[PDB]
Amino acid sequence: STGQHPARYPGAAAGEPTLDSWQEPPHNRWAFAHLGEMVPSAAVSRRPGHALARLGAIAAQLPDLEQRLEQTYTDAFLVLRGTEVVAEYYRAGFAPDDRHLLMSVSKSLCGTVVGALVDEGRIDPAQPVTEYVPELAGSVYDGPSVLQVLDMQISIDYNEDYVDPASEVQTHDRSAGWATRRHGDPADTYEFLTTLRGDGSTGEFQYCSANTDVLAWIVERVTGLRYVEALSTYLWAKLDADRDATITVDTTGFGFANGGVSCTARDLARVGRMMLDGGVAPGGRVVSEDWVRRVLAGGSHEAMTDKGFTNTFPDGSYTRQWWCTGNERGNVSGIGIHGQNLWLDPLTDSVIVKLSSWPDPYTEHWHRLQNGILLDVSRALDAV
Amino acid sequence: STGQHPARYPGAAAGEPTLDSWQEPPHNRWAFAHLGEMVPSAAVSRRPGHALARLGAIAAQLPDLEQRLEQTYTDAFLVLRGTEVVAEYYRAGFAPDDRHLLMSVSKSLCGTVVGALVDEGRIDPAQPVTEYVPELAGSVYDGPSVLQVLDMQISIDYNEDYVDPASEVQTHDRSAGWATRRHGDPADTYEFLTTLRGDGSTGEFQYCSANTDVLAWIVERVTGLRYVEALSTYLWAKLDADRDATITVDTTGFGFANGGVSCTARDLARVGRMMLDGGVAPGGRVVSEDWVRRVLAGGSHEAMTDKGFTNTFPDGSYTRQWWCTGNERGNVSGIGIHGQNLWLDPLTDSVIVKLSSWPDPYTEHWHRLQNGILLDVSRALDAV
Incomplete structure (x- = not known):
C-alpha cells in the first residue's frame, strides 16, 4: 500500500476515475472538463513553415549561432537579459508560443515547489x-x-x-x-x-x-494537493506566464514530476528570472532568498563523482534539483535529456532557455556542443 | 489492411510514433512538442469556487432558470442572440474559458468539414x-x-x-x-x-x-490531412475562436471524430453563428449557403423512426450530422450524450449552447427536461 493520495477531484475514491470509469457518475462531471488527463488528445488550432531567427544583439559576436543551434537540434532558444528578451530562435514548424517537453528540467521546478514549502516550515x-x-x-x-x-x-x-x-x-x-x-x-x-x-x-x-x-x-x-495543483499554486500561477504548462500524469493522476512538464520557452525563462530575482516572481515570492542563495552556492563538491559533468566542470556539484557548474561565472542550470536547459548566468543577470530534440538522450558529443553554445552566449552578454 | 493514412508528422512511417517509440528519432522532434497526443496530461494553471450566473434578460421570463440548469447537471450554458452573448451560466468549478467534451455534438462539426469539401467538389x-x-x-x-x-x-x-x-x-x-x-x-x-x-x-x-x-x-x-488538421483548416481556424479545441486521438493519431472534441461554450457558439450566417465565418466561408439550407430543411421524415426523438418532435428528421426537430420554430441541433447541445433557433437568429454532465448518457427524463429548457429559452427570445 502507498497510503493516502490527493483525490483526482473533490470526494473522489482512491484511483478514480480510470480509463474505464471516467464516463460514469460522479467522475464524469470532472472528466468531461479534463479529458486530456485520461485520453491522449490533440490540439485543433484556432490559427490558420520556416525558422524564426531573431538573434540580433549576440548575432554580431556569434555569426554562426543559428547554424550551431541547428546542429544541436534546437527547437526553441531564448535569451532573457534582465527583463528583456534579447535573442530568440524557433525551428521551422515550432511556433514561439508552442510548448516543449522539459524532460529533467522538470526536476528544477519540483525542487522549487519543495523550497516554497520549506520556507513555510511545512517541510524540514x-x-x-x-x-x-x-x-x-x-x-x-x-x-x-x-x-x-x-x-x-x-x-x-x-x-x-x-x-x-x-x-x-x-x-x-x-x-x-x-x-x-x-x-x-x-x-x-x-x-x-x-x-x-x-x-x-x-x-x-x-x-x-x-x-x-x-x-x-x-x-x-x-x-x-495533487502535485499538478501544487506545481501551479506554489510556482506556475505566480509567474504571470503566457500559457498554462502541462504535465503528464499516471493512472492515478500523479504528475510525472521528474520529467513530464511542457511549457513555452518564454515562460520557462520566467522561472529563471524568479531565481535571479532572489526567489520573487510577479505574483509573489516563490522561494526564500536563502533557498536561491543555496542553489547558486552549489552542493558538496566531493559528492559529485559524475565524470560526465566534472570533465567539463571540475568544481561542479548538484543541489536542490539544480546542476551547479562551479565555473568562473557561477553558472547553474536545469538540465534534461535530448538537450533541454534552463541556464542561469547571474553575472549578466540573464537566463538562457534551450529546448531541443537531439536524436540521442545523452552523449559526450551533444553536451560538449550544447555547453559550448550556452557558455559562448553567456560570454557574449558580458559588458565590453 | 486499412490503406494509406495521414502521417502523424511529415515523413512519419505508418503508425509512428507509438507510446513505446515517441522518445526515439525521428519521432521525438514532433513528440516533444505534442506529448499530450501520446500520454495523458494535465494542465498546470497560470491562474492563481462558485457558480457564475448571468442570465440577465431571459431571467425575467424564466425566473427559475438557474435551478433548472442545476437540475440538468449544467456545466456551461450560453445564449448568443445575433452576435451578442445575452445569457451565460457556469457551474461552480467550471470557468467560462474552460473546455468541455462535446460527445456527439462533435458529429455536427465533422459533417461541416465534409460539407466544406463537397463545396470544393472534392466529395460527391x-x-x-x-x-x-x-x-x-x-x-x-x-x-x-x-x-x-x-x-x-x-x-x-x-x-x-x-x-x-x-x-x-x-x-x-x-x-x-x-x-x-x-x-x-x-x-x-x-x-x-x-x-x-x-x-x-x-x-x-x-x-x-x-x-x-x-x-x-x-x-x-x-x-x-489528419482529421485533426482538417477539422482546424476547414472549420476551427476560420471561427476566430478564443481557444484551440481539442480532440482525443487513437493510437494512430486519428481523431475520434464522432465524439471526442472539447471546446469552450462561447467557441462552440461560433459554429452555430456560422450556420445562421449562411455558412460564412469571420475567417471565410466554411460551407455553402446550399449546404446550410439543406441542414435547416431537414432529412426525409419517413427515414426517422427513432421514437426517442419523434415522440417529442413528430415531424423530426436527421441530415448531414444534425438533428432536425421539424417543430414550428424549425429548430435544429447538434446533440451529445449526458446533455450536450449546439441548438439553433433561426427565428431569433440565436444559438444556445448547453454542455452538461447528466449522470446517465440518455433517459427520456433527461431529454424531456433538457428540451424543455432549450424550447423555453428559445421562446423567451421572441419579440413581444
Whole structure:
C-alpha cells in the first residue's frame, strides 16, 4: 500500500476515475472538463513553415549561432537579459508560443515547489523521508533525509540500461504511463518508488529520476494537493506566464514530476528570472532568498563523482534539483535529456532557455556542443 | 489492411510514433512538442469556487432558470442572440474559458468539414463510400453512398448494450482509446470500422457513431490531412475562436471524430453563428449557403423512426450530422450524450449552447427536461 493520495477531484475514491470509469457518475462531471488527463488528445488550432531567427544583439559576436543551434537540434532558444528578451530562435514548424517537453528540467521546478514549502516550515529537509511518507519504510528511502533526496545523495540500485525492459529506468516509465505497461509492473509511480532498494549508503551523488518523484510525493502529503495543483499554486500561477504548462500524469493522476512538464520557452525563462530575482516572481515570492542563495552556492563538491559533468566542470556539484557548474561565472542550470536547459548566468543577470530534440538522450558529443553554445552566449552578454 | 493514412508528422512511417517509440528519432522532434497526443496530461494553471450566473434578460421570463440548469447537471450554458452573448451560466468549478467534451455534438462539426469539401467538389455525396475508401469493401459500408453515411441511413449490426464488452459500442471505444483495450480488439478506429456488417438495407435512420468516423476517414483520403488538421483548416481556424479545441486521438493519431472534441461554450457558439450566417465565418466561408439550407430543411421524415426523438418532435428528421426537430420554430441541433447541445433557433437568429454532465448518457427524463429548457429559452427570445 502507498497510503493516502490527493483525490483526482473533490470526494473522489482512491484511483478514480480510470480509463474505464471516467464516463460514469460522479467522475464524469470532472472528466468531461479534463479529458486530456485520461485520453491522449490533440490540439485543433484556432490559427490558420520556416525558422524564426531573431538573434540580433549576440548575432554580431556569434555569426554562426543559428547554424550551431541547428546542429544541436534546437527547437526553441531564448535569451532573457534582465527583463528583456534579447535573442530568440524557433525551428521551422515550432511556433514561439508552442510548448516543449522539459524532460529533467522538470526536476528544477519540483525542487522549487519543495523550497516554497520549506520556507513555510511545512517541510524540514533534515527530517527523514519517512516523516512525510511513512509508506516508504522498507525501501531505499527509509533512512535518508529529504535533503539527501533534494541533493540526490542516495545510493540506489537503479539500472539505467533502458534497452533492457527489466531496468528500473524503463520500469519507471511504464509505471507512469510513458511506455506500454507489462504484466507485473507497479500500478502507478508511487508503487514503483516503494520497490526501490539500495545498500543504505548516502553522501555520494547518484542522478536518479525516482528521487524527484519522491519529492513530489512528499509535496502531496504535506499539502494535500495533487502535485499538478501544487506545481501551479506554489510556482506556475505566480509567474504571470503566457500559457498554462502541462504535465503528464499516471493512472492515478500523479504528475510525472521528474520529467513530464511542457511549457513555452518564454515562460520557462520566467522561472529563471524568479531565481535571479532572489526567489520573487510577479505574483509573489516563490522561494526564500536563502533557498536561491543555496542553489547558486552549489552542493558538496566531493559528492559529485559524475565524470560526465566534472570533465567539463571540475568544481561542479548538484543541489536542490539544480546542476551547479562551479565555473568562473557561477553558472547553474536545469538540465534534461535530448538537450533541454534552463541556464542561469547571474553575472549578466540573464537566463538562457534551450529546448531541443537531439536524436540521442545523452552523449559526450551533444553536451560538449550544447555547453559550448550556452557558455559562448553567456560570454557574449558580458559588458565590453 | 486499412490503406494509406495521414502521417502523424511529415515523413512519419505508418503508425509512428507509438507510446513505446515517441522518445526515439525521428519521432521525438514532433513528440516533444505534442506529448499530450501520446500520454495523458494535465494542465498546470497560470491562474492563481462558485457558480457564475448571468442570465440577465431571459431571467425575467424564466425566473427559475438557474435551478433548472442545476437540475440538468449544467456545466456551461450560453445564449448568443445575433452576435451578442445575452445569457451565460457556469457551474461552480467550471470557468467560462474552460473546455468541455462535446460527445456527439462533435458529429455536427465533422459533417461541416465534409460539407466544406463537397463545396470544393472534392466529395460527391452521391458516390459510394468505396470511391474514397476502397478498403471498406466487404463491410457494411460497401454499397452505401456518402450521403447515406451523412444522413445515417444504413442498417448496421451495432449492439448498443455498452455493459456488454462484446458490444460494438464498447469495442468502438476500446479501439479508439476511450477504454482499456482487450485481447483481440481492432488496433485502431479504421480497423474497427472494417469489421462492421449489416443486412445491406439502407434508407432508414439508424443512429450509429461509426458513421461519423467513416466520414472523417473519407475526409483524410480526399485531403491527405489528419482529421485533426482538417477539422482546424476547414472549420476551427476560420471561427476566430478564443481557444484551440481539442480532440482525443487513437493510437494512430486519428481523431475520434464522432465524439471526442472539447471546446469552450462561447467557441462552440461560433459554429452555430456560422450556420445562421449562411455558412460564412469571420475567417471565410466554411460551407455553402446550399449546404446550410439543406441542414435547416431537414432529412426525409419517413427515414426517422427513432421514437426517442419523434415522440417529442413528430415531424423530426436527421441530415448531414444534425438533428432536425421539424417543430414550428424549425429548430435544429447538434446533440451529445449526458446533455450536450449546439441548438439553433433561426427565428431569433440565436444559438444556445448547453454542455452538461447528466449522470446517465440518455433517459427520456433527461431529454424531456433538457428540451424543455432549450424550447423555453428559445421562446423567451421572441419579440413581444
